[PDB]
Amino acid sequence: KPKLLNKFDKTIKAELDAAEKLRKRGKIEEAVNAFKELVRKYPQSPRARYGKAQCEDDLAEKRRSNEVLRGAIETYQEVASLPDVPADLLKLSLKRRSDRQQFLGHMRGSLLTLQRLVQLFPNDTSLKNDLGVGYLLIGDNDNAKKVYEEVLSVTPNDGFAKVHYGFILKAQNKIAESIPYLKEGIESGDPGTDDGRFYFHLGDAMQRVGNKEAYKWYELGHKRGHFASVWQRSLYNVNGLKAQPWWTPKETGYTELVKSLERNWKLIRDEGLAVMDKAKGLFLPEDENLREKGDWSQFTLWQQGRRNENACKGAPKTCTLLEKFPETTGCRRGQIKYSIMHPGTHVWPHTGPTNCRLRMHLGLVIPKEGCKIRCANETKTWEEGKVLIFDDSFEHEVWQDASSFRLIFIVDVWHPELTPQQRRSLPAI
């Protein structure tokens, strides 16, 4: 189908075919040298240059070497720099380039390739959709939003642009507005729309506006394999981990950590209170749009398995105590943090991102009335000097209707069935 041979490349199609046949038979090493020979002899040939790059690409895949793949990325760029490149080849070369840049984590590099692709092919709507992803991946929601607005303005039924626009709107807290976009985009069935992120945020936006259909989408997201279940809707998962909303200390196996938290709770409390009194700016407001209303801030000692050294200056004994428990200080998918919540607070139903952690809550200052946490189908209260443990990958919700502040300490641990190499390898969240 695709037209990849310019005028000169048609005159050497026998050589080009022989080189490509070696690659398709898995003789990567022979293929690389055959295309390098063709690039040497025919230095302007775009098909020879694309062959070289595709061979490096295959070679990176066979060796699982990022080094080899970075080489292919530049060769894909070389293709686009040659004269008289056929349009289909130009687009394949630069698209593969962007995709391999994203695979390596070079999101700003991928973005630049995508910008170029859209300038070279201004009527390809799919490339604009891909450019919007480029922007989302570097955190540029403002430009992503304009890209999908542009897409919808000429192809208003594009399902991919709809779900992504709906995702952006929801992230901006434009909750009612996001719902039709997310819903119509998933229903479009277009490639790229069957994605757990859109099921997740569509049901969430519905819950926030009181729409009872929310769990219809959770159930369809479960049926289509995005959620472990209707209640456990995390998206960065190791499958097979024991899934249970509430855990006892003995079920986790972290009995020494729990004992240390409980036996030394007043010290943990008092350092948090001192920071409240004298260094309150260390407490940062929660910034993930999780509150319906009220005041909630957190003072973080560890995130992504990394100690915040300045923060630990405010809780030095607590940080020293925690250093003996790598199951939390090395939990690169969790945090260690104080959490203060004041009256009039309601945290929406929500789920954390990963089933790879469990969350311990140690009560520090707990009003006698008004504070409770629901996880799935079971609601509990905190107690001063006592640890609660739940799996925040299950939907959970919190209320604060006391007459004074509530202070807890949150200690995240690796899910206990995760192996040592799993704990060393999983990307941090």
Binding site: R197, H201, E288, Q303, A428
Partner: peptide
């Protein structure tokens, strides 16, 4: 932005190839 208590970012991880 990082995914601490929620799933609000488009992606929560920063991948590194193979």
């Amino acid at each position: 932005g990082k995914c601490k208590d929620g799933l609000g970012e488009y992606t929560c991880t920063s991948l590194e190839g193979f």
